[PDB]
Swiss-Prot record:
Organism of this sequence: Homo sapiens
Outcome recorded upon mutating residue 91 to C/D/E/N/Q: Strongly reduced CO(2) hydrase and p-nitrophenyl acetate esterase activities, impaired stability of zinc binding
Substitution effect: residue 59 to V: Reduced activity
Keywords from the UniProt entry: Acetylation, Cell membrane, Cytoplasm, Disease variant, Lyase, Membrane, Metal-binding, Osteopetrosis, Phosphoprotein, Zinc
Active-site residues, Swiss-Prot/TrEMBL: 61 (proton donor/acceptor)
UniProt cross-references to SUPFAM superfamilies, sorted A to Z: Carbonic anhydrase (SSF51069)
Full protein name: Carbonic anhydrase 2
Gene: CA2
Pfam families assigned to the protein according to its UniProt record, in alphabetical order: Carb_anhydrase
Family (UniProt): Belongs to the alpha-carbonic anhydrase family.
Length: 257
């Protein structure tokens, strides 16, 4: 029954998921003056040419666009990563207002939203095995600011009225996630966690410095989604973000000077 409300939100999670107060929780604030450029980071490789999207699902917390990850079709390699990480899904976190919504922050700045492209390390064979490993997942995180429309997002926003409530899904084939990327792949990286229960400490976070711009109209439509199921009282799907957690004994590394 976790969620994002007063009674079941991030401040409550620790009672069922005590790793909420662990040593490598996400998100974090990225202090741009303290992150250190790491000249040994190898180049980042985003290889999504063969991506095979399947379905879009409202899971009660966000909406997920799922991919076929039964072979190496859309993968992330390089950067801080060893080996090959297969794309399984992407989703977003967003706010009730344009001044909040991202999970990560940059010198305490909140963006309107944050895109997470979730990938798992193919040496562990499946996603469920990978989340039990400290290097099991790699999440590519992309900030959204409100400005000009992002054309490569519009197919997503146009299908949202078909998955308004919890447990609704729709066909979502032939979607190319390359349309969601900014021009630059300059990034920050640190070891962290899932940002929702079960908050497992299994994620290499790779957060792009360059946000994408989306229109007010596009993000307005995210906010028309519902956390509730059909035939239940309406609760708008807004503010599905966890606030920044203590950095503890971690260093954030930059790919760029
Ligand atoms: Cl996150 C997850 C993905 C797939 C299968 C199981 C998963 O969580 C397992 C779990 N739940 N509580 N601790 N580990
Ligand atoms: Cl990807 C996933 C599967 C099961 C439970 C939670 C999951 O992701 C949580 C997360 N981490 N960063 N954003 N969402
Ligand atoms: Zn996420």
């Amino acid at each position: 029954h976790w969620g994002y409300g007063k009674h079941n939100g991030p401040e409550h999670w620790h009672k069922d998921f005590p790793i909420a107060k662990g040593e490598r929780q996400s998100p974090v604030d990225i202090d741009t003056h303290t992150a250190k450029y790491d000249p040994s980071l190898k180049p980042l490789s985003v290889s999504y040419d063969q991506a095979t999207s399947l379905r879009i699902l409202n899971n009660g917390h966000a909406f997920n666009v799922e991919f076929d990850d039964s072979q190496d079709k859309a993968v992330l390699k390089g950067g801080p990563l060893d080996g090959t990480y297969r794309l399984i899904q992407f989703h977003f976190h967003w706010g009730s207002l344009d001044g909040q919504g991202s999970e990560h922050t940059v010198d305490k700045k909140k963006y309107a939203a944050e895109l997470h492209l979730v990938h798992w390390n193919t040496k562990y064979g499946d996603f469920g095995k990978a989340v039990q490993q400290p290097d099991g997942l790699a999440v590519l995180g992309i900030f959204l600011k409100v400005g000009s429309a992002k054309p490569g997002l519009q197919k997503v926003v146009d299908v949202l009225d078909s998955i308004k409530t919890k447990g609704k899904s729709a066909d979502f084939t032939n979607f190319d996630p390359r349309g969601l990327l900014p021009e630059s792949l300059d990034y920050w990286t640190y070891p962290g966690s899932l940002t929702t229960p079960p908050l497992l400490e299994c994620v290499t976070w790779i957060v792009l410095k360059e946000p994408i711009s989306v229109s007010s109209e596009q993000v307005l439509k995210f906010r028309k989604l519902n956390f509730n199921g059909e035939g239940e009282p309406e609760e708008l799907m807004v503010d599905n973000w966890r606030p920044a957690q203590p950095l503890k004994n971690r260093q954030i590394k930059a790919s760029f000077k």
